[PDB]
Amino acid sequence: YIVVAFLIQLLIILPLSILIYHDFYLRLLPADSSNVVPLNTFNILNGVQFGTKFFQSIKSIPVGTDLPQTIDNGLSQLIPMRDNMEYKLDLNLQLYCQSKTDHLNLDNLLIDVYRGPDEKIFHTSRPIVCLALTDSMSPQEIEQLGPSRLDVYDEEWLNTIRIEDKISLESSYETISVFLKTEIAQRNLIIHPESGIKFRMNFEQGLRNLMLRKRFLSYIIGISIFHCIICVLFF
Amino acid sequence: YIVVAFLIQLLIILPLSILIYHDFYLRLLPADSSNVVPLNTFNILNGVQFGTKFFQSIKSIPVGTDLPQTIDNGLSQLIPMRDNMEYKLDLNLQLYCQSKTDHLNLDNLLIDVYRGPDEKIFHTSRPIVCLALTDSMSPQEIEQLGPSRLDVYDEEWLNTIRIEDKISLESSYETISVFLKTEIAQRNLIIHPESGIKFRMNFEQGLRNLMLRKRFLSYIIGISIFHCIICVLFF
Amino acid sequence: YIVVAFLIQLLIILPLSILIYHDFYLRLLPADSSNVVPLNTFNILNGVQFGTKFFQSIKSIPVGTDLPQTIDNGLSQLIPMRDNMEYKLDLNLQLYCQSKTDHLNLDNLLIDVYRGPDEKIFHTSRPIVCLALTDSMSPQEIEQLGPSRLDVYDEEWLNTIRIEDKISLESSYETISVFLKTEIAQRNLIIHPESGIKFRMNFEQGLRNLMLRKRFLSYIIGISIFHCIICVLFF
Amino acid sequence: YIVVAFLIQLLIILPLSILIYHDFYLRLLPADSSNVVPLNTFNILNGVQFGTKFFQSIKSIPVGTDLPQTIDNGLSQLIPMRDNMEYKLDLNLQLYCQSKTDHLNLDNLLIDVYRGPDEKIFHTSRPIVCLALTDSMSPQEIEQLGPSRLDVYDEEWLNTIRIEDKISLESSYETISVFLKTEIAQRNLIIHPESGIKFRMNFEQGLRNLMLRKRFLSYIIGISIFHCIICVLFF
């Protein structure tokens, strides 16, 4: 006779909690600091000496002017960012790899992040796994990793590459560019559509910056704290 | 145990009830305020340097006339839209991919949604899986994924591509076009007949937000009432 | 000592249930509205640019004259239908597919339904599954899908294609024709013998039209209602 | 539980009792009012542009003479029919199919039942399964489907084709003929020796309907009595 009121309290607190959580987002954050810029909004330009390179110039936004938003229209569109403001990137690309030549099965993706005053900022490598002719999808793999083979490839052959806090960019610059060159052999890189670059504002305070980093973890912990305090106060 | 059981039963009961309420709202959902143009009612024009393209002209209905409905005759017919009030597209295409090139079972489908005054509005790519010669169904797959091999190819090889709430098309512009190219190799695309492009009405969010605040409240209230009653009875 | 009388009541009501159900068929329906016309009663004519096409002229039946019946003699015979009466088709074809060339395994059947005053009235596609030399019948498939391999192919490789309410035909026309062209590659189409086209009379009332649609579902629900009301009244 | 058990036991008991009563009625079923002409008692004439054809002339017995019976001597002998009272054929042929062309295990058997004044009466096609080189029996099949491989080929590869209550043959017409062609490829048909063509008497339905109303009543009464007695005793 009480679990109904328990659910009523859930549907009162949880919605109120997310509302107060967005209130904290509104006050603590400007609510438009971060800006997820998908790779497909850059200007792709392939090559052989260098792999796929994504580049896109930068427009400098005078202070006071409302900040535009990088719409995921997949259309090329300049990155917005305050001229007099430090910005800290978060490269988040996930991709598939594939090759007609049954040359190699595991390879090393090289990532270079230049900027332009031409001047390299960040370079790393990540051992990516690559499809090949002699790869077959076992029946048990289809049973366990979801019946849809696209979901199986997502679970098994997709290779996420997260780069956090390692890149910093000034709006006084322009024409950021990210290279992706597989090094051992030519490969077909299938960049997952939801791969982007989170342009953060890099507050001089560690805790709020970490909260901006771990958005989903904050979605967990802040909602949990709100629910617990509200329910304990009411009880 | 109480909260665990209440969450489990809520997760079990929400699907059917929410789908029934969705059907109820769809019955309320107007055919004038929502249209589903089947993709096969466009004009197809195959090619090589550009993928299969679907393009259809547009007729504008002056206000006062009851808005017609795009029938499933599979015959090329014009797309009906209002004079100037704004529509927001929902591409929901799903397709098999197949080839004899024996390129491996992975590829990138480039989607380009143009519009007429020869101008691009939306672009995205989705990793799709493609049939190949070195692919057979295990006896195990047929035993779990339905005995009808069409159903197995459906649960397993179908590329559901849902692009929702991302495209907006002025009624003033005409000749909307959609492109489906494959990036890595020349494939054969088999467009499932129920694939199409919804035309939701992009009406004032102030009403839509309140409608969302009316939708959410109604869904929560109904699901909570039914779930709480049935759970208390079952306890 | 009562289950015997229970079965007596069954063998009294259920035969009386079906008799009164046929009474409702006699009064509500003309008892000769629908007319299942098998494809093999058309005039098959193969081709390469177009697949198998089934065509058959139409004789216009003056009002008052008794309506003929399309006998399943498999012999070519003109379709009967009242000159001054709207008719709504139901394409119900199921088939097998096969190909000596071990090339593709899943294909796309194109269905076109013309009429003649030459003028297209319907077009659709359906992803059909096709046999190929690289297909073997596993022992477990024989154990589970029935020992008879013809029944296994029926359960597994047969692909039904139902088209309901999507076609409308006037008797003032003549020479209906249905095309079936597999598009990707030449295929051997084995049309199942019991495939036809239900020419319905398309009442202006939704409920009776739906009853005519779902003949078997009506066989279930109407008999259930008769049995329940009779048994409850007697009890 | 009562109704469930009564339905289950009825479904179990109907087979044997109904077959025994069918044999009882067959003993009553006259050899003058029912004849079974084995298909091997026709005259076979093989070919290519037309499949294997079975044709037999007809002798008419003036009334008064006791109707002879088509013996199973396997020797070509004429088909006996009455002067003018109408017979209604029941083709029940069942056959294996087999070839070295290694066309895949599926084909279409065209059946044409002609009659003489060179005139067609019935035509149908039935998907049949055909042996091929790439076909072997698993050890599992032999363990379940009888140890005799002839029995396995029977339960699994036999194409039972029953065409009942579809052909009517005037006694005045003579030289009845049956054609068995394979549509896709040249196969070897192995006609099971017990295949034939029944000759039921197409007598007045007014008697047949009442006979059906006498058959149904007797079957229902006997099955109900035995089932009810044995079930009440077993409860």
Numbering used by the authors:
A (entry chain A), B (entry chain B), C (entry chain C), D (entry chain D): 17 to 133, 147 to 264
Mind quoting what the paper says about this structure?
A key component of the LDAC is the evolutionarily conserved ER membrane protein seipin. Seipin consists of an evolutionarily conserved ER-lumenal domain and flanking transmembrane (TM) segments, and less conserved cytoplasmic N- and C-terminal regions with lengths that vary among species. Lipid droplets (LDs) form in the endoplasmic reticulum by phase separation of neutral lipids. This process is facilitated by the seipin protein complex, which consists of a ring of seipin monomers, with a yet unclear function.
As an alternative, we purified the yeast seipin Sei1–Ldb16 complex by affinity and size-exclusion chromatography from a strain that overproduced both proteins from the GAL1 promoter at their endogenous loci. We refined the class with the highest predicted resolution with C5 symmetry, which revealed a roughly 145-Å diameter complex with two alternating conformations of the TM segments that were invisible in the three-dimensional (3D) reconstruction with C10 symmetry. We designated these alternate conformations A and B. In this map, nearly all of the lumenal domain of seipin and most of the TM regions are well resolved with an overall resolution of roughly 3.2 Å. Our model for yeast seipin revealed a decameric complex with the shape of a domed cage, with the lumenal domains forming the floor of the cage, predicted to sit beneath the lumenal leaflet of the ER membrane. The TM segments form the side walls of the cage and are tilted toward the center of the oligomer, coming together in a dome-shape at the cytoplasmic side of the complex. Two ‘switch’ regions (residues 40–55 and 231–243), representing the biggest differences between conformations A and B, connect the ring of folded lumenal domains to the TM segments of seipin. In conformation A, the N-terminal TM helix is tilted roughly 40° toward the center of the oligomer, whereas the C-terminal switch region adopts a kinked α-helix connected to the second TM helix. In conformation B, the C-terminal TM helix exhibits a continuously extended helix through the switch region and lacks the kink found in conformation A. As a result, the N-terminal TM helix in conformation B is tilted further (roughly 60°) toward the center of the oligomeric assembly and both TM segments lie close to the N-terminal TM helix of the neighboring conformation A monomer. The fly and human lumenal domains possess a longer central helix that is hydrophobic, interacts with LDAF1 in humans, inserts into the ER bilayer and is implicated in binding TGs in molecular dynamics simulations. In contrast, yeast seipin has two short helices with several charged residues (for example, Q169, E172, Q173, E184) and a different orientation compared with human or fly seipin, which likely does not insert into the membrane.
